[PDB]
């Protein structure tokens, strides 16, 4: 419940995928996701490839960007 | 397809001006329970007179074929599958049954029938429970039998049983059969709470997003999650009993807790497939062939019951199906996809949208579909289905294969008032206690396609 | 001289039917078995309690 | 729920008459009355 | 062949041609019949109650 | 004086007073277990 | 467990994250003792200005 | 307007 977290993954084979979590560290965000989220049944999919901390003194700017392309499908 | 979370439920052991209503506001963004009391009263329900297991009759059929085990020549070395042709000339040979099923000068026929018919020269003679008839050929056959039609596995029916016209003796026999039987089992439930008005230690507040971020009535909620124990042990419930009739599991004291399987573990020992994508390929095929030997052409009408998510899930797969009708073109004259819609805003204004809600296959099959509430439960199904919803929405259940004349499921009930209430000053405790039981009486006639990721 | 007695049962036994397959028998004070017909397994209790 | 009263006779049905009195078995007496007190109240004072 | 549940106690049971008292007996068909007039009480004399 | 239209207005009136704790798709009511006080 | 398991559950459904859900509260027939609670629910305000 | 079956509920049901 202490800091804010940005994934960008792709789950296997079926797309890509962007999330945010609430966690206390970056090995229970991959948890929160993993469980709660839409691939519940098939976790082993989830494949997350980058984690950083919603930091604020920015405030502007991106935290994630995965575009699916007509050549990747 | 993604989620953005809408609520959180917190429990309270982790945390008056004036006001604009008197009725206090629940949101749309918050999940709601759900009772089971509009499926468990679907079903009718039945008095018995006391708590002890109960038993009824069951009626099969009569027709049989007896299996060939092995066949013989007439020396009584054991024909194998590349062995030349059997009863060459119609020479005798014979033929090894595990039981006594026909008789003395009886015709019998092989998986090809009427074109090698053998002809039996005598009664059983037994080896341990084996029948041993010493067979030969009754069609005319020059050839004999080839040695395929004579293996292990091969079904055996009767024919008749012919004479000559003159000085004949007897031949021939009868035969019969018998019925069998099945019980069921009952459960106990029992509730307590520590208890006036007012809330007790186990709460859970909800907080709902939005941008910028009263009294309890025990004797209402006390019935309403004992209305959820009945709920949840009729529908939702299981067994623990052995094969030899032992319970596994044992009470505070000493005695077995005696539980009995619910609608949903008693449904679920036949007709039951686990499917990974649901395709009218898997839908249509099992339903003919429970459909091609159990029921007439005209009863053939089944209702699917199904979710929310589940009716999306039929509606764009028969519209992949009719996609794919190469002969026919839809038009909109007859579908109707676009209408007619009188608005202000044009005089020929139109309108768009259709589902596809029935699906009607060959041999009078009719596959109907309807969306029963219970499976959208937030509360109990908790694993996810990518496409939107809890993935028990996917499941469809077939209820009500065919006409009976007696309802197949009910729900068991002792005469009168089979509940019980209990108050304990000391500590002030309401103690509950209730019994119950759902029969379901032939589980051939209820069908489920269950999604794989709730399996095992 | 003070005496006192007391008997246990389950809770379940309130009616409790008896299928008999053999009768079932209420003792007698004089020592003999009397064959009876009722079927409630509590009625044959409270004979034996007094 | 209380069902719809406006009906034609012939569309009041034994079921609908039932529906009538499941729904006034789900009434909890706790609830809104403009110039009654509360029973909670009133069984104080006798 | 198989079973309706996990506790079915009968399976279809069948026969061909001569049927004998055990034939019919061992299809649950054939009871002993319960002599309800007969009764024996067990003579003695009762000093109870004395 | 009152129409069909306007009998239909007094009949599909939000009525917390004439409604039902479980409603149409199953979905339980929670403020049949509270008390105002 | 309950449900007859004689092999018992995966080391995989049992993990942190799976959510569990209350059922209902069975005991045996004879002598059994008190079982399960009750849950509840707290209200939350919101608010506007002049 | 009480049916038989009405009876046996006012009947089976307890006095207890």
Same mark, same amino acid.
């Given at each position: 419940?202490?800091?804010?977290?940005?994934?960008?993954?792709?789950?296997?084979?079926?797309?890509?995928?962007?999330?945010?979590?609430?966690?206390?560290?970056?090995?229970?965000?991959?948890?929160?996701?993993?469980?709660?989220?839409?691939?519940?049944?098939?976790?082993?999919?989830?494949?997350?490839?980058?984690?950083?901390?919603?930091?604020?003194?920015?405030?502007?700017?991106?935290?994630?960007?995965?575009?699916?392309?007509?050549?990747?499908? | 397809?993604?989620?953005?979370?809408?609520?959180?439920?917190?429990?309270?052991?982790?945390?008056?001006?004036?006001?604009?209503?008197?009725?206090? *506001?629940?949101?749309?963004?918050?999940?709601?329970?759900?009772?089971?009391?509009?499926?468990?009263?679907?079903?009718?329900?039945?008095?018995?007179?006391?708590?002890?297991?109960?038993?009824?009759?069951?009626?099969?059929?009569?027709?049989?074929?007896?299996?060939?085990?092995?066949?013989?020549?007439?020396?009584?070395?054991?024909?194998?599958?590349?062995?030349?042709?059997?009863?060459?000339?119609?020479?005798?040979?014979?033929?090894?049954?595990?039981?006594?099923?026909?008789?003395?000068?009886?015709?019998?026929?092989?998986?090809?029938?009427?074109?090698?018919?053998?002809?039996?020269?005598?009664?059983?003679?037994?080896?341990?429970?084996?029948?041993?008839?010493?067979?030969?050929?009754?069609?005319?056959?020059?050839?004999?039998?080839?040695?395929?039609?004579?293996?292990?596995?091969?079904?055996?029916?009767?024919?008749?049983?012919?004479?000559?016209?003159?000085?004949?003796?007897? *031949?021939?026999?009868?035969?019969?059969?018998?019925?069998?039987?099945?019980?069921?089992?009952?459960?106990?439930?029992?509730?307590?709470?520590?208890?006036?008005?007012?809330?007790?230690?186990?709460?859970?507040?909800?907080?709902?997003?939005?941008?910028?971020?009263?009294?309890?009535?025990?004797?209402?909620?006390?019935?309403?999650?004992?209305?959820?124990?009945?709920?949840?042990?009729?529908?939702?419930?299981?067994?623990?009993?052995?094969?030899?009739?032992?319970?596994?599991?044992?009470?505070?004291?000493?005695?077995?807790?005696?539980?009995?399987?619910?609608?949903?573990?008693?449904?679920?020992?036949?007709?039951?497939?686990?499917?990974?994508?649901?395709?009218?390929?898997?839908?249509?095929?099992?339903?003919?062939?429970?459909?091609?030997?159990?029921?007439?052409?005209?009863?053939?009408?089944?209702?699917?019951?199904?979710?929310?998510?589940?009716?999306?899930?039929?509606?764009?797969?028969?519209?992949?199906?009719?996609?794919?009708?190469?002969?026919?073109?839809?038009?909109?004259?007859?579908?109707?996809?676009?209408?007619? *819609?009188?608005?202000?805003?044009?005089?020929?204004?139109?309108?768009?949208?259709?589902?596809?809600?029935?699906?009607?296959?060959?041999?009078?099959?009719?596959?109907?579909?309807?969306?029963?509430?219970?499976?959208?439960?937030?509360?109990?199904?908790?694993?996810?289905?990518?496409?939107?919803?809890?993935?028990?929405?996917?499941?469809?259940?077939?209820?009500?294969?065919?006409?009976?004349?007696?309802?197949?499921?009910?729900?068991?009930?002792?005469?009168?008032?089979?509940?019980?209430?209990?108050?304990?000053?000391?500590?002030?405790?309401?103690?509950?206690?209730?019994?119950?039981?759902?029969?379901?009486?032939?589980?051939?006639?209820?069908?489920?396609?269950?999604?794989?990721?709730?399996?095992? | 001289?003070?005496?006192?007695?007391?008997?246990?049962?389950?809770?379940?036994?309130?009616?409790?039917?008896?299928?008999?397959?053999?009768?079932?028998?209420?003792?007698?004070?004089?020592?003999?078995?009397?064959?009876?017909?009722?079927?409630?397994?509590?009625?044959?209790?409270?004979?034996?309690?007094? | 729920?209380?069902?719809?009263?406006?009906?034609?006779?012939?569309?009041?049905?034994?079921?609908?008459?039932?529906?009538?009195?499941?729904?006034?078995?789900?009434?909890?007496?706790?609830?809104?009355?403009?110039?009654?007190?509360?029973?909670?109240?009133?069984?104080?004072?006798? | 062949?198989?079973?309706? /549940?996990?506790?079915?106690?009968?399976?279809?049971?069948?026969?061909? /041609?001569?049927?004998?008292?055990?034939?019919? /007996?061992?299809?649950?068909?054939?009871?002993?019949?319960?002599?309800?007039?007969?009764?024996?009480?067990?003579?003695?004399?009762?000093?109870?109650?004395? | 004086?009152?129409?069909?239209?306007?009998?239909?207005?007094?009949?599909?009136?939000?009525?917390?007073?004439?409604?039902?704790?479980?409603?149409?798709?199953?979905?339980?009511?929670?403020?049949?277990?509270?008390?105002?006080?």
């Amino acid at each position: 419940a202490m800091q804010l977290w940005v994934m960008e993954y792709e789950v296997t084979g079926i797309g890509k995928g962007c999330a945010m979590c609430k966690a206390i560290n970056p090995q229970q965000a991959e948890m929160l996701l993993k469980s709660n989220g839409i691939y519940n049944g098939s976790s082993y999919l989830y494949k997350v490839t980058r984690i950083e901390q919603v930091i604020v003194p920015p405030c502007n700017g991106l935290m994630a960007e995965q575009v699916v392309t007509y050549k990747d499908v | 397809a993604g989620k953005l979370g809408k609520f959180q439920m917190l429990g309270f052991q982790h945390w008056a001006p004036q006001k604009a209503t008197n009725l206090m *506001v629940q949101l749309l963004a918050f999940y709601r329970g759900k009772s089971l009391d509009t499926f468990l009263n679907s079903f009718p329900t039945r008095e018995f007179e006391d708590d002890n297991e109960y038993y009824w009759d069951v009626i099969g059929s009569s027709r049989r074929n007896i299996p060939l085990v092995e066949a013989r020549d007439e020396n009584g070395v054991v024909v194998a599958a590349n062995a030349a042709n059997v009863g060459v000339g119609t020479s005798p040979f014979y033929l090894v049954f595990p039981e006594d099923w026909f008789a003395d000068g009886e015709v019998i026929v092989g998986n090809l029938n009427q074109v090698y018919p053998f002809r039996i020269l005598g009664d059983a003679r037994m080896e341990g429970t084996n029948a041993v008839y010493k067979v030969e050929l009754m069609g005319g056959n020059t050839q004999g039998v080839p040695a395929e039609r004579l293996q292990q596995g091969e079904r055996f029916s009767i024919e008749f049983a012919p004479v000559e016209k003159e000085l004949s003796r007897k *031949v021939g026999d009868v035969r019969f059969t018998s019925p069998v039987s099945m019980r069921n089992e009952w459960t106990t439930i029992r509730i307590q709470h520590k208890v006036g008005n007012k809330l007790n230690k186990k709460l859970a507040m909800g907080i709902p997003m939005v941008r910028n971020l009263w009294m309890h009535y025990v004797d209402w909620e006390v019935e309403l999650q004992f209305d959820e124990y009945k709920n949840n042990a009729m529908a939702w419930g299981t067994s623990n009993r052995n094969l030899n009739g032992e319970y596994m599991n044992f009470g505070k004291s000493g005695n077995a807790i005696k539980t009995g399987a619910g609608i949903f573990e008693q449904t679920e020992v036949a007709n039951t497939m686990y499917y990974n994508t649901f395709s009218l390929k898997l839908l249509e095929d099992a339903l003919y062939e429970l459909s091609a030997s159990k029921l007439a052409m005209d009863d053939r009408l089944f209702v699917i019951k199904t979710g929310e998510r589940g009716a999306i899930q039929f509606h764009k797969e028969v519209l992949k199906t009719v996609s794919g009708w190469t002969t026919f073109v839809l038009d909109n004259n007859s579908t109707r996809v676009v209408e007619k *819609v009188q608005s202000r805003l044009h005089s020929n204004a139109l309108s768009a949208g259709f589902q596809f809600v029935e699906y009607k296959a060959p041999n009078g099959v009719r596959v109907r579909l309807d969306v029963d509430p219970f499976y959208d439960d937030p509360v109990r199904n908790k694993i996810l289905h990518p496409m939107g919803g809890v993935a028990f929405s996917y499941r469809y259940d077939i209820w009500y294969i065919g006409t009976m004349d007696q309802p197949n499921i009910f729900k068991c009930k002792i005469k009168g008032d089979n509940e019980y209430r209990g108050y304990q000053w000391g500590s002030a405790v309401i103690h509950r206690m209730a019994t119950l039981g759902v029969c379901v009486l032939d589980p051939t006639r209820t069908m489920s396609l269950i999604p794989a990721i709730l399996q095992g | 001289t003070t005496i006192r007695i007391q008997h246990k049962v389950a809770g379940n036994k309130l009616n409790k039917k008896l299928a008999m397959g053999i009768p079932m028998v209420r003792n007698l004070e004089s020592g003999k078995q009397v064959k009876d017909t009722a079927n409630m397994w509590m009625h044959y209790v409270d004979w034996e309690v007094e | 729920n209380f069902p719809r009263q406006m009906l034609p006779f012939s569309k009041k049905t034994k079921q609908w008459r039932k529906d009538c009195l499941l729904w006034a078995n789900q009434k909890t007496f706790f609830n809104y009355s403009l110039v009654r007190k509360s029973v909670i109240h009133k069984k104080i004072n006798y | 062949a198989g079973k309706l /549940g996990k506790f079915q106690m009968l399976g279809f049971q069948h026969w061909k /041609g001569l049927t004998s008292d055990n034939h019919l /007996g061992a299809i649950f068909q054939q009871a002993p019949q319960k002599a309800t007039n007969l009764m024996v009480q067990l003579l003695a004399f009762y000093r109870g109650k004395s | 004086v009152l129409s069909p239209k306007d009998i239909k207005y007094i009949e599909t009136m939000p009525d917390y007073i004439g409604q039902g704790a479980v409603d149409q798709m199953d979905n339980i009511d929670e403020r049949y277990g509270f008390v105002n006080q």
